[PDB]
Each structure stands twice: as structure tokens, then as C-alpha cells.
Amino acid sequence: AMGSMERASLIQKAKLAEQAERYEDMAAFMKGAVEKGEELSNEERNLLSVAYKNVVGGQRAAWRVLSSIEQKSNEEGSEEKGPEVREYREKVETELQGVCDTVLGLLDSHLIKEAGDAESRVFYLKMKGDYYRYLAEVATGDDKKRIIDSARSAYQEAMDISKKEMPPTNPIRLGLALNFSVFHYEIANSPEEAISLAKTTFDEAMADLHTLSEDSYKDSTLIMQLLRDNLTLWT
């Protein structure tokens, strides 16, 4: 639907959509921009991520509300209310899965394969892990283990690159570690791995802060605080 709009206009409108808190539009504009076939700049990658994270974040929050209602509905003592709660949870779930499949499709066609610098490759592999993780959150069938493994594999490749090519304070490296740690805690039933990863990441970043400018220090310490928040919650 965006094929007839200039790439630059799509990027401009994505920024306008962000200002207007129109995240579905923002995501559609950024999808159109990706489909032009050119690589994304750092700013453009961040627009893509903001757009889809906001869209899928609203879907995930709604899914959790509906899943909780459905769970209460299937407690013994609860009255039969019919198929409607399940149906509507399934509707939201299918829409969520569709968004995740769309993002994964953009990464596979062809953002990852064209991404050679560590900053872009780690960013996209982190995103791949994230959207498989969101699929894993709602998965219950025969492919659930494979979905979890797909998330793990993408995160692991991103981690391996990030450790070799980025400093321990790099915000992309830190955000990847944060999310992989959440994967371990919430998805893979590995709370000790989650805690170890968060603590090692935090400590290695702390030791590298002395190399940073004031502005970089602010960026890195912000994400370190997210790691600390999780460590405080989990221990």
C-alpha cells in the first residue's frame, strides 16, 4: 500500500505518526520504508523498533487481560459464559501473531542478510529474538519448543557478536542482554541464568563507564538501571 510513496516521505510520516502517538500508522510507514529495499540508518532502525514495539505492546497487554479473564472463567465455581472470552482472546492473539510474523518477515526479507556492521546486525537479531519471544508468550502447541528455540538462537547470535564487537556499555548490547535475561526468566524457565546474565552485564558495564562522555554515560546508565530493577525484583 506504501509502494507509491517516496522512501523519504514514509520516514517523515513515521516521525509525524510518532509525534501523534499513531503507532499503527508509524509501523505501516516504516514497513513501507523497509520494503523499498535499502538498508536502514541508525535513526530509521529505531523508528522501526519504536513503531512495532508500541503496536505489539498494546496487543500483548490486551492479550494478558483477556487471558486472565479466560483463566478465571475456567476455575471451578465459575459460571459458564460461553465461547466468547476464548474467541476474543483468540482474535487478539491472532492479530498479535500477525504483527510478529510481519516483523520477522521484514527481518528475513532482507534486513538481516544485508546487515554487516555490528550495530545493525545485533539490533536486528535482537529484534528477531524479541518477536519470537512474543510468539512464545502465547504459544501452547506442538511448535512452542521450536518457537522458544528460535528466540534463543537469535538472541545467542546477537550476544556472540555484541561481546566480540561492542564495548560492554554499548546501549544496543545492554538492551539485548536485558531482553535475553527476560527471555531466560520468563520463557525458558531459567531464572538463575537470567540473574547471572543481568548481573554480569551490569558489572561489566559499570567497569567501562569511565571511558564515556557525559551523554554516553547517561545513555548507558539508564539501561543499567533497568537491569538493576530486574535484579531487585528477582532476588
Binding site: 536485558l178 539501561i223 530493577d229
Partner: peptide, 7 residues
């Protein structure tokens, strides 16, 4: 108090 991921 929900755990943090990278927003």
C-alpha cells in the same frame, strides 16, 4: 511491579 524489557 512488572519486570523491565527494552522499550
Amino acid at each position: 511491579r512488572r519486570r523491565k524489557s527494552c522499550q
